[PDB]
Design a protein around this ligand. Structure first.
Ligand SMILES: [Zn+2]
Ligand SMILES: [Zn+2]
Lengths: 50, 347, 58, 343, 49, 58, 103, 53, 65, 148, 148
RNA sequence: GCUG
């Protein structure tokens, strides 16, 4: 909720996306993990073709 | 760094130069599979006299012009050394005495600095004194009167019609008699790395490894100078579809789409002759694929027919330096059926 | 990384260098341009004898 | 006839739909059957003429007729790279507190042009950093940005809010060395433009520096080049092969540049004539129109070159061309002296 | 992703392990609408050649 | 070999002459050292060339 | 040591000689080549830069008969100097005339 | 059957081996280490049977 | 960050023109017409003013002052 | 003399398979005096040939009619009386293939001579008695003058 | 502060990456009638195999844009069309397909082919040869295996 | 993780 004139007091860039942490001075992003949907009936072939 | 065969590591004579990169003649790009796009290469300095000799005699580039596999040359001409040579040896090229000398004088550097240059007799005499560009090319194969090389080659070019027997309309039959180019332009199949019938290979066996290496060096000097001063460029005009193709495509596409619909109708409601060994659906795919692929083939021929000579894309396909008639037809006329694992796009 | 492959079958070597490559058609096919910064480092042990004594002095 | 075909080959470069034909210069001894092309100094002197089409401060346009491309290209190459000028080589920096990096600020100062005349100064020897009155010029730039004491409350504009907010080339002040002050009257040695923006400052930020200017040629660095651009174009010679009349004249006038083709109603019927071929920019749009492509020929006279020189303001453009001819003459003289030394 | 350019407006007050900047950046002469949405033409990475 | 060494001062051999001359050279020891199958291939090629000479001269 | 003349062969045949010109580029070589190729005696004249890095041009003059090749090269340098002297005088006269009409 | 073999587009083109019109072509692109295109051709007018790149 | 002093290809001084160009744009002048008034006839020179992004003003907001 | 062959030729076609090149055209010609057909490439920029033209074509071993075969080098600059002063077009090339007519299985007399003028080809085909004096690896001057 | 040298990687917004191979003076570049000489010369051989027609249009749309103070859009499945930018170039006196009459800077004689000229966005990549040149003569060794 |  800051204005671009008040980002300048904080030494931050209005265009900087955020969405990341600062932990011990390094910027770290939690990446989006792709997963399978739990609670769903998979119907698939075994190795042996059953 | 990745070595798939023995020619990926070779021994070279060092020469010290100021700039930071490693540099070598682009004829040796094909053995290393190098492409100058920020590529890195390794260098090793053998610390022993016995290791110099084994490197020089066994691993030298002049001793390794041919791959061990099928015995075909890998150090040969590449892009802008095939295109410049092709455009030089075309029948339309004529040079006066001032420009003949200024192309030939490029070779007079290094160990050729002491030779007398042997400007050949002109072809045309009375109206004007002209040198045909094939003669300038022959100075590569024999640059001085004391040079013993007498190369001989006789082979079919890339765009040979099959009936000319040195009188073809495409000027695509090569004769090199006593190191003089009597007919035919120089393509990939004659100056390049693809296969035999390559002048460099013929010299290698006939006149030894050193004579073959010298020619490759001489062409590399001569080809850039001709192209740099003639000019080759590609522009949106070159790839722009002409009116003839624009009409033809509409007709071909409409006809093809209609035929496909009929075949679709039969499978949906009726009898489609099931091709041997296949289900009806499989058959429909085959019939549809042929009609589409036939439309693509028809739309491609039309574009090539109207593309004017001097279209740069066409030249590079004919001489084989880069690209093919598929690529031209694909960016001008029609991109093909997109196929994943050899079939139409799965659901 | 085991002794058989990492330290025996393939091993790191000295008197070696690496750089970006770039074209030069004015060199012969048997030649390679080496930069001065690599050439001042990569040395070859020349044994002194009657043919090279006055050359190695310079 | 065939004689007509050869005359075009040796005299006109013909622009075509796909390529430019007759590009090479073929006037050398023995290249033709009935023509003598051996050098004749008397013939060259009679044929050569230089005409000044236009001269304004910082721009000279002239035509050289009867000169060859190789001699003409040398003049363009000498003007761009071998005519000497004075430019900043070393910047000594004390107290640079600006946002602009000192290496970037040093590069910007080297690019700025100096109005000092190069012929008066001499080339500095290798090393010899200290320099002498003859070989160098010293310029000192000291600017400190301060808030304007009397300012409006809003102060949205930086110019009202701050004094010395922008460093301009006017701030640079010449420091005379030795007898230079007497030799050059006040204002002779100054940056040519006076408005180039070296840097931008905020209150409390100061740039203090001393610059040494040395004579150099364009080959070493582009900062020493004396011409914004020097180029030559062969004179256009459009010829209408067949008389063109009617609405065709209007389309033919449209295909070419704005003033080259003038349509005149000789009998109340429009007819096309070529009035000012020099203005033609050779867009070659005539080839787009199928009917007019065969009725006109686009060609350039090979031996008439229109040369355009735009100076950076360091010295008058006419003097620059004269200096370029002298530099080429000097190179030939040096080699002749070496031949005399050898023999 | 690897082109030299401008990290942001705080780039001079920023101390990082390794930072690359282009001295005189220019904005693209031909541009997408996506370039205007992400505001790439405010801190561009390249020069017209 | 025909183009590097054309011999304008020498006669053109007939089909019988070409076969006879080849046999005389083939009997030399250096040819015997080479595998017989390779020698047979040369003889078959020479026989084919000799047949072409007759067809033309007929 | 700007000019080093290398004869074609050990026999030192004068007709073919390569002049290596130090601190030179296409500007002197191309202009000299045109002046020395307008000589009837010179059968072949060409210039080659050994490498872009080194500022040297090798100029090879092959004469028609017994001329030493120094004589054609020297005559070409003399002709280039005369062409430059004429252009400078003609250019200066034309520039002065233009300013006078403007005044 | 031969008709079951030649129900593919290409005919009357040129192979680099035997130049015959009755042909059976193929095109691939699915290796982006190969920035050039990929083709393979079959040529069976004289039943010569080449299969190259 | 700041307007380049000389055009990269031609070498014309374009540092002086930035202040005038901004002022002409502040008035009704069109971008093509503004470049024409400054005298930047060749395309190489025009792109330098047209494509320049002025970050010095934005960066200075974060400068110490 | 040093003349090998000489006849008057009439042009019968200019481009059989279209205009493949700008400067060069493939002239197919037939001779009056003998039954000789001629394939000839000429530079039609310097020398323009039309579909009805009749020309005289001499092939000569030496360009000086006194029969001196002294050709160490050809000097364009040198001016002496020669054969080329009577002819409009001249080319220098090498005879490179003599080949027999394949089109009859018995009792044939037609021969083909091929000359290459730096890549501009000529096929001269006719009775063996008229092609006498051609030999492979020999160098010949073509000479050519159009007739009114 | 680093200045571009041989071996520095540049790229061009269409996957046409390429290391610097030679740096030539302004006096040796080809130049147009207006005096423009290129900052970069790009080899035409990249385009046929790779079919980057969008680079060919970007050069044309940009050129028509700098000449009239516009930013032409290149948005996917849309963008400014070739037919519009061709008419902008001819209005400003350039050829509609961007090809120009180019003179050789080496010889002064004009080039035969017209050369495509325009502004193409080029981005400098982080890979520089100064940060990558490496050499070892002899030096420190690992403690376990006494090898480099 | 990315370049090779
Ligand atoms: Zn096949
Ligand atoms: Zn500019």
């Amino acid at each position: 909720g800051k204005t671009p004139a008040e980002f300048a007091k904080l030494n931050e860039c209005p265009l900087d996306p955020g969405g990341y942490f600062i932990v011990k001075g390094v910027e770290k992003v939690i990446l989006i993990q792709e997963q399978l949907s739990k609670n769903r009936i998979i119907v698939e072939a075994d190795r042996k073709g059953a | 760094q990745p070595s798939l065969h023995k020619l990926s590591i070779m021994a070279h004579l060092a020469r010290v130069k100021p700039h930071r990169t490693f540099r070598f003649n682009e004829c040796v790009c094909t053995p290393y599979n190098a492409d100058f796009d920020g590529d890195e290469m390794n260098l090793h300095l053998p610390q022993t006299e016995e290791a110099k000799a084994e490197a020089l005699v066994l691993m030298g580039t002049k001793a390794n012009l041919v791959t061990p596999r099928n015995g075909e040359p890998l150090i040969a001409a590449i892009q802008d050394f095939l295109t410049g040579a092709y455009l030089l040896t075309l029948k339309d090229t004529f040079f006066d005495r001032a420009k003949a000398c200024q192309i030939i004088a490029s070779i007079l550097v290094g160990k050729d600095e002491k030779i007398k240059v042997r400007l050949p007799p002109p072809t045309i005499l009375k109206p004007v004194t002209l040198w045909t560009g094939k003669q300038i090319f022959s100075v590569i194969l024999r640059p001085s009167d004391d040079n013993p090389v007498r190369a001989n080659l006789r082979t079919k070019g890339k765009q040979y019609c099959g009936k000319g027997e040195d009188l073809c309309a495409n000027d695509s039959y090569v004769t090199i008699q006593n190191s003089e180019l009597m007919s035919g332009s120089m393509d990939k199949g004659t100056l390049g790395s693809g296969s035999k019938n390559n002048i460099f290979y013929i010299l290698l066996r006939d006149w030894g490894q050193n004579e073959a290496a010298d020619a490759m060096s001489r062409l590399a000097r001569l080809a850039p100078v001709y192209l740099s001063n003639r000019g080759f460029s590609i522009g949106i005009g070159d790839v722009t579809p002409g009116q003839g193709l624009l009409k033809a495509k509409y007709e071909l596409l409409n006809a093809g789409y209609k035929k496909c619909d009929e075949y679709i109708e039969a499978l949906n409601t009726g009898k489609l002759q099931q091709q041997p060994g296949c289900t009806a659906e499989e058959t429909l795919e085959a019939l549809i694929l042929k009609e589409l692929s036939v439309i693509r083939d028809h739309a491609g021929s039309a574009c090539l027919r109207e593309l004017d000579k001097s279209n740069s894309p066409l030249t590079m396909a004919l001489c084989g330096s880069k690209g093919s008639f598929i690529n031209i037809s694909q960016m001008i006329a029609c991109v093909g059926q997109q196929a994943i694992s050899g079939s139409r796009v799965p659901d | 990384q085991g002794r058989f492959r990492g330290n025996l079958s393939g091993k790191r070597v000295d008197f070696s260098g690496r750089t970006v490559i770039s074209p030069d058609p004015n060199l012969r096919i048997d030649e390679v341009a080496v930069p001065v910064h690599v050439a001042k480092i990569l040395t070859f042990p020349e044994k002194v004898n009657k043919a090279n004594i006055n050359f190695l002095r310079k | 006839a065939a004689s007509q075909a050869v005359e075009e080959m040796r005299s006109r470069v013909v622009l075509g739909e796909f390529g430019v034909r007759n590009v090479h210069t073929t006037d050398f001894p023995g290249n033709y059957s009935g023509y003598d092309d051996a050098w004749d100094q008397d013939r060259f002197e009679k044929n050569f003429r230089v005409d000044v089409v236009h001269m304004d401060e910082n721009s000279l346009e002239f035509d050289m007729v009867g000169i060859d491309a190789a001699i003409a290209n040398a003049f363009r190459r000498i003007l761009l790279a071998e005519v000497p000028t004075m430019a900043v080589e070393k910047v000594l920096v004390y107290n640079n507190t600006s946002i602009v990096q000192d290496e970037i600020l040093a590069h910007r100062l080297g690019l700025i042009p100096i109005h000092a005349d190069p012929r008066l100064f001499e080339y500095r020897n290798q090393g010899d950093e200290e320099g002498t009155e003859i070989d160098t010029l010293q310029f000192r730039l000291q600017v400190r940005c301060t808030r304007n004491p009397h300012a409006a409350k809003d102060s949205s504009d930086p110019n009202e809010l701050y004094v010395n907010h922008k460093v301009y080339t006017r701030h640079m002040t010449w420091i005379p060395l030795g007898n230079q002050a007497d030799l050059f009257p006040e204002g002779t040695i100054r940056p040519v433009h006076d408005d180039i923006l070296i840097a931008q400052l905020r209150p409390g930020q100061e740039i203090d520096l001393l610059m040494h200017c040395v004579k150099g040629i364009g080959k070493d660095h582009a900062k020493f080049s004396p011409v914004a651009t020097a180029s030559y174009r062969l004179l256009p010679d459009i010829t209408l092969l067949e008389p063109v009349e009617g609405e065709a004249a209007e389309e033919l006038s449209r295909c070419f540049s704005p003033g080259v083709i003038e349509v005149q109603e000789v009998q109340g019927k429009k007819v096309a004539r070529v009035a000012n071929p020099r203005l033609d920019t050779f867009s070659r749009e005539i080839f787009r129109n199928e009917k007019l492509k065969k009725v006109v020929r686009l060609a350039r006279v090979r031996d008439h070159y229109i040369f355009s020189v735009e100076s950076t303001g360091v010295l008058p453009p006419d003097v620059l061309v004269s200096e370029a001819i002298k530099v080429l003459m000097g190179k030939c003289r040096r080699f002749l002296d070496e031949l005399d030394a050898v023999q | 992703k690897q082109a030299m350019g401008t990290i942001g407006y705080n780039q001079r007050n920023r101390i990082d392990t390794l930072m690359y900047l282009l001295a005189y950046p220019q904005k693209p002469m031909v541009k997408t609408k996506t370039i205007e949405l992400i505001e790439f033409e405010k801190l561009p990475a390249g020069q017209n050649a | 070999i025909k183009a590097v060494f054309p011999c304008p001062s020498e006669p053109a051999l007939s089909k019988n002459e070409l076969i006879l001359t080849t046999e005389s050279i083939m009997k030399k020891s250096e040819f015997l050292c080479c595998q017989d199958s390779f020698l047979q291939e040369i003889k078959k090629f020479i026989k084919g060339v000799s047949e072409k000479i007759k067809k033309t001269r007929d | 040591k700007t000019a080093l003349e290398m004869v074609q062969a050990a026999g030192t045949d004068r007709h073919c000689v390569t002049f290596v010109l130090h601190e030179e580029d296409h500007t002197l070589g191309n202009s000299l080549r045109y002046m020395i190729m307008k000589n009837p005696e010179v059968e072949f004249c060409g210039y080659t830069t050994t490498h872009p890095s080194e500022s040297k041009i090798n100029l090879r003059i092959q004469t028609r008969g017994t001329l030493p090749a120094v004589e054609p090269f020297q005559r070409g340098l003399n002709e280039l100097m005369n062409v430059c002297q004429h252009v400078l005088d003609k250019f200066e006269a034309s520039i002065k005339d233009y300013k006078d009409q403007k005044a | 059957g031969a008709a079951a073999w030649e129900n593919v587009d290409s005919t009357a083109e040129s192979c680099p081996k035997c130049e015959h019109p009755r042909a059976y072509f193929m095109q691939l692109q699915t290796r982006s280490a190969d920035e050039p295109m990929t083709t393979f051709y079959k040529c069976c007018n004289a039943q010569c049977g080449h299969r190259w790149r | 960050m700041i307007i380049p002093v000389r055009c990269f290809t031609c070498g014309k001084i374009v540092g002086n023109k930035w202040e005038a160009y901004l002022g002409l744009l502040q008035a009704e002048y069109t971008e093509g017409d503004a470049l024409d008034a400054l005298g930047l006839k060749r395309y190489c020179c025009r792109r330098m003013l047209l494509a320049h992004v002025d970050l010095i003003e934005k960066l200075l907001n974060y400068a110490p002052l | 003399a040093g003349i090998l062959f000489e006849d008057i030729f009439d042009v019968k076609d200019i481009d059989p398979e279209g205009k493949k090149f700008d400067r060069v055209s493939r002239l197919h010609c037939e001779s009056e005096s003998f039954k000789m057909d001629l394939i000839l490439d000429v530079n039609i920029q310097i020398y323009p040939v039309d579909l009805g033209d009749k020309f005289r074509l001499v092939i000569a071993s030496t360009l000086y009619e006194d029969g001196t075969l002294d050709d160490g080098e050809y000097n364009p600059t040198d001016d002496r009386p020669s054969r080329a002063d009577q002819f409009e077009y001249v080319m220098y090339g090498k005879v490179y293939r003599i080949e027999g007519d394949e089109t009859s299985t018995e009792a044939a007399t037609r021969l083909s001579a091929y000359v290459s003028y730096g890549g501009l080809l000529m096929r001269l085909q006719g009775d063996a008695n008229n092609l006498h004096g051609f030999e492979v690896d020999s160098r010949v001057y073509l000479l050519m003058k159009k007739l009114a | 502060t680093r200045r571009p040298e041989i071996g520095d990687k540049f790229s061009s917004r269409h996957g046409q990456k390429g290391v610097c191979g030679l740096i030539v003076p302004q006096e040796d570049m080809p130049f147009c009638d207006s005096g423009i000489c290129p900052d970069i010369i790009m080899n035409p051989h990249g385009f046929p195999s790779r079919m980057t027609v969008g680079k060919l249009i970007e050069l044309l749309a940009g050129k028509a844009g700098v000449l009239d103070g516009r930013f032409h859009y290149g948005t996917a499945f849309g963008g400014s069309k070739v037919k519009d930018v061709c008419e902008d170039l001819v209005r400003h006196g350039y050829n509609y397909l961007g090809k120009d009459y180019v003179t050789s800077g080496i010889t002064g004689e004009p080039l035969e082919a017209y050369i495509y000229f325009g502004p193409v966005y080029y981005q400098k990549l982080k890979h520089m040869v100064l940060d990558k040149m490496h050499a070892r003569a002899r030096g420190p060794r690992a403690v376990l295996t006494r090898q480099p």
